[PDB]
A and B are shown apart, each in its own frame.
Chain A
Amino acid sequence: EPKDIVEVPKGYVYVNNKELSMEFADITDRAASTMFFGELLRGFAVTLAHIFKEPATINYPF
């Protein structure tokens, strides 16, 4: 995990303190994600998958 950017006490959770690394493996990862839309592929496959869940429509009025 990357370090934070603002030190947090308890009773809270900062949802953006995580740093965007500049390590070469980290930049090339993000670059490859943009060049081949990995994140879109993850979401794409999700919806394909979720065809294979049975719809929850009640056959009203029967």
Chain B
Amino acid sequence: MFYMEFILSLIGSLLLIICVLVSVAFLTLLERKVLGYIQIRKGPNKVGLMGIPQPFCDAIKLFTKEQTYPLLSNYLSYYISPIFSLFLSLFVWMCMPFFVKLYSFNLGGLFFLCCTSLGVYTVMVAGWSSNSNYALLGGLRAVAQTISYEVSLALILLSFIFLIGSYNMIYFFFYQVYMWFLIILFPMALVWVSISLAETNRTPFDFAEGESELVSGFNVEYSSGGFALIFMAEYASILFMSMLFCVIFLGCDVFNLLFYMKLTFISFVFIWVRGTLPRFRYDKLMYLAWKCFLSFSLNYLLFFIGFKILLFSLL
């Protein structure tokens, strides 16, 4: 009955939270192994049996490591941002689609836009709390990157949204029931990888945390426990985008293991980029954001709007 409904809804949310957290913490190893073999390294195979408990080992180190809090009175404000970031990276999951009702969450695309937007405030205030020009430059560069890409991200969404005829994500499954949707929108997939990669701040768009240009960007002044939360937040983010890529382009077959095979392959693909590409410049990226992607997205918008008008004409 009714309270059966609510109890399960909370169990599912809680159950998903532990899984996504343990997955991303455990996924970190797969980055370290996989990148280890892109390079001709062997990757972690030392601790436990073949480095399986490597990420648990990492967490124990961090939580034991003290919290080298910055200048005297910043305690809270420096302690806020990691919470307010890991929260977004997790809670963004709850809109993800199921056939087995977790929610009746409509406007899921809008909610995606919103959560992906809120990352700016976390990084920016984090740098501001740190109060170190290195951290501050990182935040500004991080802010500019995310804010710029959201513009293209929105219009890109709309192409799919029109092609499915609603904002409810679930209809991606019904429209993909015959033939996958990548093979229709191939260029969008490459662009969407880049947009997703920009959001999660991975390379080639690695300006926010980065290395060798800023020490760690905003992350530079973060002690252990805060750092662990930021680091987990980023990987919860990289997984979610991998899921969103899977549900849009590659079948949305939530009740089929092949969907989870596809999750791993896409998250692998993110790493596959990590070990291959070099980094962009500031300005060249902004050209790529406004002068290249926005034009691209508008054309497809004007292309598919006509197509659906023609489609509506036919039926």
Query: Do A and B have CB atoms closer than 8 angstroms in the complex?
Result: yes
- Of B7-15, B32-40, B122-130, the segment with at least 4 beta carbons within 8 Å of chain A is B32-40
Q: Digit string of A3-32 for contact with B (CB within 8 Å is 1, else 0)?
A: 000000000000000000000000000000
We find that the number of chain B residues with CB closer than 8 angstroms to chain A is 13
Q: Digit string of B169-181 for contact with A (CB within 8 Å is 1, else 0)?
A: 0000000000000
Instruction: Give complex CA distance A56, B36 in Å.
Output: 11
We find that the number of chain A residues with CB closer than 8 angstroms to chain B is 14
B residues in contact with A36, CB < 8 Å: 187, 190
User: What is the distance, in angstroms, from A41's C-beta to the closest C-beta of chain B?
Assistant: 10
Is B41's CB under 8 angstroms from A47's CB? no
Is A55's CB under 8 angstroms from B272's CB? no
User: What is the distance, in angstroms, from B130's C-beta to the closest C-beta of chain A?
Assistant: 35
Any A CB within 8 A of the CB of B42: yes
Any A CB within 8 A of the CB of B295: no
Chain B residue, CB-CB nearest to A48: B272
User: What is the distance, in angstroms, from B275's C-beta to the closest C-beta of chain A?
Assistant: 6
| A43 in complex: contacting residue of B43, B190, B276, CB < 8 Å | B276
Instruction: Give complex CA distance A51, B276 in Å.
Output: 12
B residues in contact with A57, CB < 8 Å: 41-42
Chain B residue, CB-CB nearest to A56: B40
B residues in contact with A56, CB < 8 Å: 40
A residues in contact with B275, CB < 8 Å: 47
Instruction: Give complex CA distance A56, B42 in Å.
Output: 8
Is B272's CB under 8 angstroms from A50's CB? no
Within 8 A of A (CB), among B1-54: 36-38, 40-43
A residues in contact with B43, CB < 8 Å: 55
User: What is the distance, in angstroms, from A57's C-beta to the closest C-beta of chain B?
Assistant: 4
User: What is the distance, in angstroms, from B295's C-beta to the closest C-beta of chain A?
Assistant: 13
Is B36's CB under 8 angstroms from A55's CB? yes
Is A44's CB under 8 angstroms from B40's CB? no
Is B41's CB under 8 angstroms from A51's CB? no
User: What is the distance, in angstroms, from B217's C-beta to the closest C-beta of chain A?
Assistant: 25
List of 7 A-B pairs having minimum Cβ-Cβ separation, nearest first: A57-B42, A55-B42, A51-B37, A47-B276, A47-B38, A55-B40, A55-B41
22 A-B pairs with C-beta separation under 8 A: A35-B187, A36-B187, A37-B190, A40-B277, A44-B272, A47-B272, A47-B275, A47-B276, A48-B272, A50-B38, A50-B40, A51-B37, A51-B38, A53-B40, A55-B36, A55-B40, A55-B41, A55-B42, A55-B43, A56-B40, A57-B41, A57-B42
Beyond A35-B187, A55-B40, A55-B42, 6 additional pairs, beta carbon < 8 A:
A40-B277, A47-B38, A47-B272, A50-B38, A55-B36, A57-B41
